[PDB]
Short mmCIF file of N, CA and C in Angstrom, two decimals:
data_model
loop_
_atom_site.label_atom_id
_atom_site.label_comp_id
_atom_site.label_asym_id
_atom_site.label_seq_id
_atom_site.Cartn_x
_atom_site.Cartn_y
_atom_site.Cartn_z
N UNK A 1 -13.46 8.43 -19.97
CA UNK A 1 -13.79 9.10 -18.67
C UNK A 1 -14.43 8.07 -17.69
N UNK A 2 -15.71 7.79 -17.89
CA UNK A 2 -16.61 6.48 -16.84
C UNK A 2 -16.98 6.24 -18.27
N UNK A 3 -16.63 4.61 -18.01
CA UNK A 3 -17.14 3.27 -18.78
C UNK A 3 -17.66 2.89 -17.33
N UNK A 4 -18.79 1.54 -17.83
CA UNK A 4 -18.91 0.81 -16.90
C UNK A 4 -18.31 -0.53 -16.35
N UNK A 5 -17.56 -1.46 -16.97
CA UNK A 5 -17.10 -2.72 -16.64
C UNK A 5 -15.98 -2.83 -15.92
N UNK A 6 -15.28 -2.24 -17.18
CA UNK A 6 -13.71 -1.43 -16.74
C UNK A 6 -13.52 -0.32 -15.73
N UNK A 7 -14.37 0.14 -15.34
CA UNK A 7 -14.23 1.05 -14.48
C UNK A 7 -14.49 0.56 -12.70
N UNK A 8 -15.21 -0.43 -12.84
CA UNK A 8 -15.88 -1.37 -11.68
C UNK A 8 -14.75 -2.80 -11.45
N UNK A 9 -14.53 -3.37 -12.39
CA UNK A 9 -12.52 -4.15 -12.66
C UNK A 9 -11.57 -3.27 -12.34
N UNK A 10 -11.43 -1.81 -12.67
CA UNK A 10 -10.12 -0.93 -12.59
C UNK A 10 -9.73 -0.82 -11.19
N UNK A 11 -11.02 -0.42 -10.20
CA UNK A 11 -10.75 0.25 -9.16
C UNK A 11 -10.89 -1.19 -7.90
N UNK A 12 -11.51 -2.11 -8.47
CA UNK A 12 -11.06 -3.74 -7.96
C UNK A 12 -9.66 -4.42 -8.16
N UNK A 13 -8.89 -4.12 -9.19
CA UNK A 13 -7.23 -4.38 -10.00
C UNK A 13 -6.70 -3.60 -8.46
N UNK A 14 -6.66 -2.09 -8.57
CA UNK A 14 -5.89 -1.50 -7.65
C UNK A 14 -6.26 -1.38 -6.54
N UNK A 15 -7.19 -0.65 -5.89
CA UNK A 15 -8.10 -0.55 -4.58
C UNK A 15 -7.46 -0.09 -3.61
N UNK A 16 -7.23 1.40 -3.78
CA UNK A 16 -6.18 2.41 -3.08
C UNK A 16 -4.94 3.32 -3.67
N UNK A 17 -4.26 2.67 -4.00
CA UNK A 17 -3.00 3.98 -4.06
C UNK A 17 -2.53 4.31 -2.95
N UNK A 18 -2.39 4.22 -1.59
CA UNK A 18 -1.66 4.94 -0.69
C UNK A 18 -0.11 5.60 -0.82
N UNK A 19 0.90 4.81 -1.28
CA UNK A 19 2.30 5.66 -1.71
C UNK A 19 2.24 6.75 -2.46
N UNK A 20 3.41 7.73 -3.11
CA UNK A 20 3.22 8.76 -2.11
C UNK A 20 1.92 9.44 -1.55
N UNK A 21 2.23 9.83 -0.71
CA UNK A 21 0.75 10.93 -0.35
C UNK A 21 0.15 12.22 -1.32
N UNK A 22 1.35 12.82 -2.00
CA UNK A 22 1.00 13.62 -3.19
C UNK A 22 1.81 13.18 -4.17
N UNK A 23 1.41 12.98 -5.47
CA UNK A 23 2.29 12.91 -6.45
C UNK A 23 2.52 14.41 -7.29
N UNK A 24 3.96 13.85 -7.86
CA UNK A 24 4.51 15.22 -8.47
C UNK A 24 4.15 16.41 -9.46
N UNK A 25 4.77 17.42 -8.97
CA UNK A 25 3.43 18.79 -9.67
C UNK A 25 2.52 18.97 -11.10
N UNK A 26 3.55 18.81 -12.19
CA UNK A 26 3.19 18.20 -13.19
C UNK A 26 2.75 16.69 -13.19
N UNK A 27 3.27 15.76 -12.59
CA UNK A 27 2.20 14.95 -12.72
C UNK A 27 0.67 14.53 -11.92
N UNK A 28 0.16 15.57 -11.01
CA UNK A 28 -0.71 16.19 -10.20
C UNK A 28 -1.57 17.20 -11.50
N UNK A 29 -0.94 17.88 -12.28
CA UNK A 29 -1.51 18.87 -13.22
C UNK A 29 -2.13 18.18 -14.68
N UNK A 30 -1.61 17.16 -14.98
CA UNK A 30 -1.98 16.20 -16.41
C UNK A 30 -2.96 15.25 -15.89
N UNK A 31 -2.93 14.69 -14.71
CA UNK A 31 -4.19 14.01 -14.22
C UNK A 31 -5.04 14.44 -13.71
N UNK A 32 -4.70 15.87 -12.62
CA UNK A 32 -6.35 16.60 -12.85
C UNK A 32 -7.08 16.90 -13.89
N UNK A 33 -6.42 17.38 -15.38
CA UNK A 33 -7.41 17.35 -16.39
C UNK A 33 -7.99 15.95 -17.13
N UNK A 34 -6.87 15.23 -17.26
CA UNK A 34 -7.62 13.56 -17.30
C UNK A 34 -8.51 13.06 -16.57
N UNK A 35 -8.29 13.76 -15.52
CA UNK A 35 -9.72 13.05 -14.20
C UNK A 35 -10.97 14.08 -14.36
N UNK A 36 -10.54 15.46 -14.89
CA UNK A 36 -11.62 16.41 -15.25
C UNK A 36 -12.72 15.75 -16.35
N UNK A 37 -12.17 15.40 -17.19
CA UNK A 37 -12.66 15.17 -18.91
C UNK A 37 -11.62 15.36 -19.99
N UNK A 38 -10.67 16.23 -20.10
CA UNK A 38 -9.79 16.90 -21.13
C UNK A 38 -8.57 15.66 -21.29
N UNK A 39 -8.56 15.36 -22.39
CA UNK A 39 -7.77 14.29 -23.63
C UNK A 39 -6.59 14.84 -23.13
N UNK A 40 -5.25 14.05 -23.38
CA UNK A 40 -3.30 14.30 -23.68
C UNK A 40 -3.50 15.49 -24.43
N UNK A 41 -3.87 15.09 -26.04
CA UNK A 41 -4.31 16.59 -26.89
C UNK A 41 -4.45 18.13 -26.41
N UNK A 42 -5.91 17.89 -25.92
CA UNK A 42 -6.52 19.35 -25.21
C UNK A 42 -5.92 19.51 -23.92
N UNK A 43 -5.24 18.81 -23.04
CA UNK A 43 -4.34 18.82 -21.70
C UNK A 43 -3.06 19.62 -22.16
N UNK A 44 -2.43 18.71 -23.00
CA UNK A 44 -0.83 19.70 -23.89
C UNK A 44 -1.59 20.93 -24.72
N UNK A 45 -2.89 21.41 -25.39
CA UNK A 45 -3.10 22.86 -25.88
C UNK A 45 -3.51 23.50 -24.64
N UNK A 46 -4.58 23.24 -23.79
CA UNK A 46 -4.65 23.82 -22.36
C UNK A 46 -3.02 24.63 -21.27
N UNK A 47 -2.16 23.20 -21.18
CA UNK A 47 -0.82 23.58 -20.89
C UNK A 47 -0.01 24.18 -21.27
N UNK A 48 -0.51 24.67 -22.91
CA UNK A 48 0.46 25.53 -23.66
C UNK A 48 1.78 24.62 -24.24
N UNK A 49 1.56 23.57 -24.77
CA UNK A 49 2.73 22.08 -25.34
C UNK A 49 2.35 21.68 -26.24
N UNK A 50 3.21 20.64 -26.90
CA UNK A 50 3.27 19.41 -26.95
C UNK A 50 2.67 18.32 -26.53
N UNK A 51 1.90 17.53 -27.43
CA UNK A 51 1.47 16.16 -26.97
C UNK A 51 2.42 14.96 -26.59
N UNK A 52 3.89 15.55 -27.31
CA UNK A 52 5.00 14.21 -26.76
C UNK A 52 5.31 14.63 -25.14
N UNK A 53 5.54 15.92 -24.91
CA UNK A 53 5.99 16.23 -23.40
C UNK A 53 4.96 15.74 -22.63
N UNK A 54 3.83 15.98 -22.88
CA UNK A 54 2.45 15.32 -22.14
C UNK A 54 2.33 13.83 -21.96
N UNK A 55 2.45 12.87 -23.22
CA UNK A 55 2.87 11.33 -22.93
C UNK A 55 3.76 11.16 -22.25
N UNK A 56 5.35 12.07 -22.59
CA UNK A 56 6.26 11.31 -21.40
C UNK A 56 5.55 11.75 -19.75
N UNK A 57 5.17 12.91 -19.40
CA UNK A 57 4.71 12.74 -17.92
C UNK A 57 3.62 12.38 -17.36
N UNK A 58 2.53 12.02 -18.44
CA UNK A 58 1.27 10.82 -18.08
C UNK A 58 2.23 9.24 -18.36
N UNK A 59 2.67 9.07 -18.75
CA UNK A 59 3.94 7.59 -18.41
C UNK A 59 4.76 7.39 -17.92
N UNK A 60 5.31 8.49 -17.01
CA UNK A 60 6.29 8.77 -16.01
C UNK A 60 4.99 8.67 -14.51
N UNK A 61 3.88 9.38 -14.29
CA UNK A 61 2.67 9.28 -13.61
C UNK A 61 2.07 7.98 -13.44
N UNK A 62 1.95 6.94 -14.72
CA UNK A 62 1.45 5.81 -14.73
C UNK A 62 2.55 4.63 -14.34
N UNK A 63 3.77 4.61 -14.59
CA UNK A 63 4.71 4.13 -14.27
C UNK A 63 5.52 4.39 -13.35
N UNK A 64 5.20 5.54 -11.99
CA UNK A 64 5.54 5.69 -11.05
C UNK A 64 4.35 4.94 -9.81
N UNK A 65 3.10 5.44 -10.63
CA UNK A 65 1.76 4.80 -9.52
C UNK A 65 1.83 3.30 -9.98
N UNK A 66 1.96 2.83 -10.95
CA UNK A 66 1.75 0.96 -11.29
C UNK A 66 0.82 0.96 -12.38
N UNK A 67 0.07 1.19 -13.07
CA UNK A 67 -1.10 0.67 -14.33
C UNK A 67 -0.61 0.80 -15.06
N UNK A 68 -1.08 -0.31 -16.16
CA UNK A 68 -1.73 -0.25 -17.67
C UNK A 68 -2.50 -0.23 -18.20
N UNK A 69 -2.99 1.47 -18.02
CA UNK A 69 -3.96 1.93 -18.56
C UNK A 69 -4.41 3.46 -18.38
N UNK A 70 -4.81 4.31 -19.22
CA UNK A 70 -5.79 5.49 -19.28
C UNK A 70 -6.04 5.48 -18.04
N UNK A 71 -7.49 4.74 -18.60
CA UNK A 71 -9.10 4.84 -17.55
C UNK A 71 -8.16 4.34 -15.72
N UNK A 72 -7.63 3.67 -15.35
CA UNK A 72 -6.25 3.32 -14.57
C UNK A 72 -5.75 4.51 -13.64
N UNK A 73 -5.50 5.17 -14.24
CA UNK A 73 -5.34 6.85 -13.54
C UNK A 73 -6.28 7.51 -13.33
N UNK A 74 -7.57 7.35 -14.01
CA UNK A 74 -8.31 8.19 -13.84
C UNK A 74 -9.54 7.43 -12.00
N UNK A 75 -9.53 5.98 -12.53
CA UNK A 75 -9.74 4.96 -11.12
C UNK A 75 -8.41 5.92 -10.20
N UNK A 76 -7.60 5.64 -9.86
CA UNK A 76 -6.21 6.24 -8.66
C UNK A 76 -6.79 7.50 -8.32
N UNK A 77 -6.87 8.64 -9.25
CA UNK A 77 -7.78 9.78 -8.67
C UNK A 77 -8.90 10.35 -7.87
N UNK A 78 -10.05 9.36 -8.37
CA UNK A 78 -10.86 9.28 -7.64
C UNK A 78 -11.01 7.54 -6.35
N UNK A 79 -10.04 6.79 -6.40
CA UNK A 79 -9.73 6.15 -5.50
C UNK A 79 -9.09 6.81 -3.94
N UNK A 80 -8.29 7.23 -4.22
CA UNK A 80 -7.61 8.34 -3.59
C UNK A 80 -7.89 9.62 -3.02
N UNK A 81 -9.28 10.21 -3.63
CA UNK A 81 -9.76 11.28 -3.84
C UNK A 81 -9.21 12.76 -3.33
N UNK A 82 -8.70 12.74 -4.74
CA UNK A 82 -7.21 14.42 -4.67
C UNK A 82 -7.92 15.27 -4.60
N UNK A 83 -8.71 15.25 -5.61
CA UNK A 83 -9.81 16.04 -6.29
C UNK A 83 -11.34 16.20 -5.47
N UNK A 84 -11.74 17.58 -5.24
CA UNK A 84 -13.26 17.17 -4.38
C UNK A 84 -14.19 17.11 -5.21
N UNK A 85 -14.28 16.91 -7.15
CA UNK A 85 -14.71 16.52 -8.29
C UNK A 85 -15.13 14.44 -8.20
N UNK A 86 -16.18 14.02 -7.29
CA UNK A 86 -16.26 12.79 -7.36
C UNK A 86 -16.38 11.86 -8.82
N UNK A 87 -16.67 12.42 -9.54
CA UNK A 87 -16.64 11.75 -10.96
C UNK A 87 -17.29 10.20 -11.29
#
């Protein structure tokens, strides 16, 4: 969720996100709970799934925005700020 090193490097690596202006519905729905607190795991039992359907569209999400990494998406969220949850 918040580390400190990596989290202060993460949002220095990227420093924005501007393309698209919203990203896609499901992948808008798997990173609000990643940016909430809630794991792939508890995100796919929350969603009513699968943890494989959940990896492919948090890596379809991460590989549409650019990172390698988790904590990576969760920096873009509150870089961006989708969410009125500052974190």
């Amino acid at each position: 969720y918040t580390p400190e090193s990596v989290a202060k490097l993460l949002e220095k690596i990227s420093a924005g996100g501007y393309g698209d202006k919203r990203l896609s519905p499901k992948e808008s729905e798997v990173l609000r709970l990643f940016a909430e607190g809630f794991l792939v795991t508890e995100i796919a039992k929350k969603l009513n799934r699968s943890i494989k359907t959940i990896s492919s569209q948090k890596k379809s999400a991460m590989m549409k925005l650019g990172v390698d990494n988790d904590i990576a998406l969760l920096n873009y969220l509150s870089s961006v700020s989708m969410t009125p949850v500052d974190k």
